[PDB]
């Protein structure tokens, strides 16, 4: 299996008195390990996975230092962006930041990234080469020249190829019991008559990690991307995920229909067929 | 672990 570390930051302006909202969360693959919330009492970076708790006070203090710099920078940013777009202080605006890194099965650097958005739309992003920027509009171009002068991309490449990669490895080792597991899907099928001459078949996948899964339905082994309701992969609450797919079927003809489950924890891909 | 250097837009 390959692996990722990702940090997601969301800052939101609240017009007038008091302060804006800031939420930061860290992920290793699809497992949240940290958070900071500005409305929380502690004003510290907090653990959200038992394997990170064992980190020392020097870790937690440093991460609390850095996340406050992230927080304060985002607040500064909100005013600047309001200034670039010539916007009033009355409106509520959202800033979002995402950065992190992926590794191969060899646990070497595969790619790094750093994406930034304003009101739910791409503003500026670092390219896969990590030396140059992709600006969305004229305001972002103004930031691009400033970040180019400040050698921001050099600093990010250093973190993304170096520090990011090393801490991911450590987290994968320290949290191996949870992070390096692969819970395969527990599958089954259900049958419900919808009319006189129609039935609904629903293919269920439960209790699986990681989240990436593929559920196809097939009629005579031909793909059926039409006539098929697919709910989004959703979280169970216990660190595993859930999904289902479904098809409307002319009753009598249930044995022609197959559901195909692909997943990391499945040695071979599964194939289900209804059986009374 | 978080990035250290964060530069304002």
């Amino acid at each position: 299996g390959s692996h990722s570390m990702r940090y997601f930051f969301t800052s939101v302006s609240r017009p007038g008195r008091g302060e804006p909202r800031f939420i930061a969360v860290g992920y290793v693959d699809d497992t949240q390990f940290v958070r900071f919330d500005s409305d929380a009492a502690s004003q510290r970076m907090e653990p959200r996975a038992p394997w990170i708790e064992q980190e020392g006070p020097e870790y937690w203090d440093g991460e609390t230092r850095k996340v406050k710099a992230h927080s304060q920078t985002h607040r500064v940013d909100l005013g600047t962006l309001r200034g670039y777009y010539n916007q009033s202080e009355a409106g509520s605006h959202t800033v979002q930041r995402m950065y992190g890194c992926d590794v191969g099965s060899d646990w070497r650097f595969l790619r790094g990234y750093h994406q930034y958005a304003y009101d739910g739309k791409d503003y500026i992003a670092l390219k896969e080469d990590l030396r140059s920027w992709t600006a969305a509009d004229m305001a972002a171009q103004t930031t691009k020249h400033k970040w180019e002068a400040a050698h921001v991309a050099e600093q990010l490449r250093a973190y993304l190829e170096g520090t990011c990669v090393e801490w991911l490895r450590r987290y994968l080792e320290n949290g191996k019991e949870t992070l390096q597991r692969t819970d395969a899907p527990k599958t089954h099928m259900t049958h419900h008559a919808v009319s006189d001459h129609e039935a609904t078949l629903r293919c269920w996948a439960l209790s699986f990690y990681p989240a990436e899964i593929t559920l196809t339905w097939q009629r005579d082994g031909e793909d059926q991307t039409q006539d098929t309701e697919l709910v989004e992969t959703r979280p169970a609450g216990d660190g595993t995920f859930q999904k289902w797919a479904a098809v409307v079927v002319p009753s009598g003809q249930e044995q022609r229909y197959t559901c195909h489950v692909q997943h990391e924890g499945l040695p071979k891909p599964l194939t289900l067929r209804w059986e009374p | 672990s978080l990035l250290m250097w964060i530069t304002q837009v």
Partner: T-cell receptor, first 116, second 117 residues
């Protein structure tokens, strides 16, 4: 260019009293620090003024003696409580971004003479 | 860790000669370097900084410094001194590889330059 007002500029007070120095900034800025220096001598960092929480103090400096408050990113105060002759020095409000290249600015200073 | 030594408290020069304010640095990772000046009854004013790229960095009033990796130095230089340049001069380093979240610059003790007319 970030300009830094400090008020008061000069103040003479006596053992046991407390002075509360202000630091205003013309725009909103990321990091804020409180430095303390003797004339013609090295800077000593007191603490780091975090927006919306207790300041992070340096070894030898405690919140009981050196209250710090930062309501805005533009405004902060350092109070120096139960003063004594040794606490006499220049108190500097420093400011700057959290970027790698970003420059760290200082302010006019506040001369504190503490007498018995 | 990170630190800078300014090994000279007082530096003297005649007006119009070369002035040299010396600074070395020690750093675990890679350095961004800084110079600051203080005239009486004021905060530290910014002079110049080596971010990256060109080792020779030019600033204001004919001030400069060269980034020398081998001697681990960033000495401030100016070809001909004026009297107004008599001040307290501070060197400062930033370990760009640090991940500990102490953002402040780490300064030296200070070298007092006296440009005698």
């Amino acid at each position: 260019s970030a300009v830094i007002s400090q008020k008061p500029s000069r103040d003479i007070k006596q053992r046991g009293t407390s002075l509360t120095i202000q630091c205003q900034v013309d725009s909103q800025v990321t990091m804020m620090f409180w430095y303390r220096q003797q004339p013609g001598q090295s800077l000593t960092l007191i603490a780091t003024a975090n927006q919306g929480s207790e300041a992070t103090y340096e070894s030898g400096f405690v919140i009981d003696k050196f209250p710090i408050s930062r309501p805005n990113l533009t405004f902060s105060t350092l109070t120096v409580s139960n003063m004594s002759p040794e606490d006499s020095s220049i108190y500097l409000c420093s400011v700057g971004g959290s970027g790698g290249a970003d420059t760290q600015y200082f302010g006019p200073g506040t001369r504190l003479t503490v007498l018995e | 860790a990170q630190s800078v030594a300014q090994p000279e408290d007082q530096v003297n020069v005649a007006e119009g000669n070369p002035l040299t304010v010396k600074c070395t640095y020690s750093v675990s990772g890679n350095p961004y370097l800084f110079w600051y000046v203080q005239y009486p009854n004021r905060g530290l004013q910014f002079l110049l900084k080596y971010i990256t790229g060109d080792n020779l960095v030019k600033g204001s009033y004919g001030f400069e410094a060269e980034f020398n990796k081998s001697q681990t130095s960033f000495h401030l230089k100016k070809p001909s001194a004026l009297v107004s340049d008599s001040a307290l001069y501070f060197c400062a380093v930033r370990d760009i590889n640090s991940g500990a979240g102490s953002y402040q610059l780490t300064f030296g003790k200070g070298t007092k330059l006296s440009v005698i007319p």
